[PDB]
Amino acid sequence: IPESSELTLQELLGEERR
């Protein structure tokens, strides 16, 4: 979904906690 929030949230909780 083009919500951007889910994408940014998953992105942050992806590289930060990589």
For residue 2, give every residue at least 6 positions away whose Cβ sits within 8 Å of its Cβ, in sequence order, or none: none
Question: What is the rounded radius of gyration, in angstroms, for the C-alpha atoms of the chain?
Answer: 8
CA distance 18 to 11: 10
The approach used to solve this structure was: NMR
DSSP string, 2-13: TTSHHHHHHHHH
| Residue 8 token pair | 């940014």
CA distance 3 to 11: 13
**Maximum alpha-carbon separation in the chain:** 23
Secondary structure (3-state) at 17: coil
> What is each CA distance from 11 to 7, 18, in whole angstroms?
6, 10
DSSP state of 18: -
